[PDB]
Amino acid sequence: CPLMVKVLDAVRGSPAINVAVHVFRKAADDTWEPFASGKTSESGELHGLTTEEEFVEGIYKVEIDTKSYWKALGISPFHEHAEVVFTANDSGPRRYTIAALLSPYSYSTTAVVTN
Amino acid sequence: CPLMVKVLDAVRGSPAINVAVHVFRKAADDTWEPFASGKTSESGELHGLTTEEEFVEGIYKVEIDTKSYWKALGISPFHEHAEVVFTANDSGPRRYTIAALLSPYSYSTTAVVTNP
Amino acid sequence: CPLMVKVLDAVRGSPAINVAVHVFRKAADDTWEPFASGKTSESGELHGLTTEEEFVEGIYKVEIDTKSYWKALGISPFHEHAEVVFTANDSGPRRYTIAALLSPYSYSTTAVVTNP
Amino acid sequence: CPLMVKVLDAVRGSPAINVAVHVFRKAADDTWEPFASGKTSESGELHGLTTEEEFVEGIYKVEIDTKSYWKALGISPFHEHAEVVFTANDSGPRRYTIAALLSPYSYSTTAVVTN
Numbered sequence: 001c002p003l004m005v006k007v008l009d010a011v012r013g014s015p016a017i018n019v020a021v022h023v024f025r026k027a028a029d030d031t032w033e034p035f036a037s038g039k040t041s042e043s044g045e046l047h048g049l050t051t052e053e054e055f056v057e058g059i060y061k062v063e064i065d066t067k068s069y070w071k072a073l074g075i076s077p078f079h080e081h082a083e084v085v086f087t088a089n090d091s092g093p094r095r096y097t098i099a100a101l102l103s104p105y106s107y108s109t110t111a112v113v114t115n
Numbered sequence: 116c117p118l119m120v121k122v123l124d125a126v127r128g129s130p131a132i133n134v135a136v137h138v139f140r141k142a143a144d145d146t147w148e149p150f151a152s153g154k155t156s157e158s159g160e161l162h163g164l165t166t167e168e169e170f171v172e173g174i175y176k177v178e179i180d181t182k183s184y185w186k187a188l189g190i191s192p193f194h195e196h197a198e199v200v201f202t203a204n205d206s207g208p209r210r211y212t213i214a215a216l217l218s219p220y221s222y223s224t225t226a227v228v229t230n231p
Numbered sequence: 232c233p234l235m236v237k238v239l240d241a242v243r244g245s246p247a248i249n250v251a252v253h254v255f256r257k258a259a260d261d262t263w264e265p266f267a268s269g270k271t272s273e274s275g276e277l278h279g280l281t282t283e284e285e286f287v288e289g290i291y292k293v294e295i296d297t298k299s300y301w302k303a304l305g306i307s308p309f310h311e312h313a314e315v316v317f318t319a320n321d322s323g324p325r326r327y328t329i330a331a332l333l334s335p336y337s338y339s340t341t342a343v344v345t346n347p
Numbered sequence: 348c349p350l351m352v353k354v355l356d357a358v359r360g361s362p363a364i365n366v367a368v369h370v371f372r373k374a375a376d377d378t379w380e381p382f383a384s385g386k387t388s389e390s391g392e393l394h395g396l397t398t399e400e401e402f403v404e405g406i407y408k409v410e411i412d413t414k415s416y417w418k419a420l421g422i423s424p425f426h427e428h429a430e431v432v433f434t435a436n437d438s439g440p441r442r443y444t445i446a447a448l449l450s451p452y453s454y455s456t457t458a459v460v461t462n
């Protein structure tokens with residue numbers, strides 16, 4: 001599991017469940033090509049997106065469909081989605097956790113990168 | 116204005132209005148002595164808490180009454196309040212803005228510290 | 232000033248100065264058209280990006296160039312930039328402040344939306 | 348594990364390891380009495396602080412010694428510590444995760460409360 005995504009709900013104090021997540025890899029012509037996707041689990045986590053062999057160095061975008069999440073709760077949100085854009089860098093044998101903490105008009109994201 | 120507090124609401128996308136704020140300073144006997152208090156304005160800002168003369172070196176606690184805020188709005192929040200504890204002015208006088216961003220089960224606080 | 236961007240530095244406890252900001256608007260063909268750009272001032276604020284007339288209904292992307300900011304400071308950050316994507320003015324004109332708080336491996340963004 | 352604490356470092360993108368954490372329970376005279384304490388692990392987590400039998404309803408304070416953490420990294424921080432103060436409420440059979448994300452001049456804390 002080189003790449004894991006975790007989404008939390010700051011309004012209800014819970015995992016953000018059944019949130020759609022799309023990962024893209026930046027192509028040579030600067031466009032975003034689909035790479036992997038899924039929905040967060042009951043624990044707010046999305047595992048199994050990719051493998052060590054497939055996850056090469058490059059620029060990646062993680063798009064979290066926050067708008068649909070809030071609308072399913074009857075809450076009008078600000079953002080269309082949350083986007084996290086980063087470079088994967090091999091300098092070391094490591095795993096990336098992209099975590100996002102969601103509010104209707106705000107979100108915060110951090111990377112936990114470990115060996 | 117050596118000490119300012121600003122509070123935002125992450126549910127409403129607005130300033131957090133009418134938030135009570137209590138400031139304490141640690142005394143020589145290690146207890147928290149009341150130092151200043153007030154509430155945020157329509158802009159979510161609290162000015163005029165203290166003066167350059169009275170805001171001496173020390174350890175200060177800024178207590179933001181988030182529970183009263185959310186409850187006054189009919190929401191049941193997780194935290195009792197948000198506490199910001201810091202040493203101030205120990206390299207001479209600085210100006211401090213304490214900012215807080217509130218959600219019912221989460222808050223974040225940052226400080227902007229400038230040299231006048 | 233219908234659109235303002237403010238950026239703070241959580242490592243330094245200061246405004247984030249000289250941060251480049253690019254704004255895009257989604258076009259009819261679903262591509263991102265350049266809309267406005269600038270950089271944050273000494274106060275960490277970026278004013279004058281647009282006007283009430285030109286800031287029409289649409290989907291906007293505010294790209295904050297956090298990597299260039301941290302690298303200009305000799306730090307190697309995680310993110311390429313911070314992107315804030317939102318529908319604006321679809322219930323009539325509003326004023327938007329987009330705030331971002333930056334660390335090398337983390338950022339948070341909030342919006343304050345007011346009705347003039 | 349009714350109560351777990353997790354601490355993350357936003358500067359290095361890692362767990363915050365070997366961070367001292369003290370939990371207090373508010374006593375009838377409004378004073379804070381020591382309840383439980385420990386140091387975060389290699390994963391930034393502190394488990395085993397208390398038990399279901401001991402963790403009754405009441406007001407609790409979790410104090411995270413952020414100052415020592417940053418000083419051990421040669422970074423001058425703003426806060427003396429991070430304090431998280433909350434009421435434990437039985438309305439439901441649940442577990443509390445108190446998470447904190449640390450920067451030198453800022454911190455953010457969220458509660459993830461689950462069954």
Ligand SMILES: O=C(O)c1cccc(/C=C/c2ccc(B(O)O)cc2)c1
Nearest residue numbers: 214216223224225330331332339341
């Ligand atoms: O704490 C966070 O997570 C956070 C995140 C994103 C933005 C902010 C805003 C801070 C702020 C600081 C000072 C002023 B001011 O001097 O008027 C206004 C806003 C705070």
Ligand SMILES: O=C(O)c1cccc(/C=C/c2ccc(B(O)O)cc2)c1
Nearest residue numbers: 099101108109446447448455456457
């Ligand atoms: O963004 C904020 O404001 C914020 C605030 C408080 C905590 C967090 C992080 C939560 C988290 C929990 C577990 C993992 B993990 O699977 O190692 C990672 C992150 C983020």
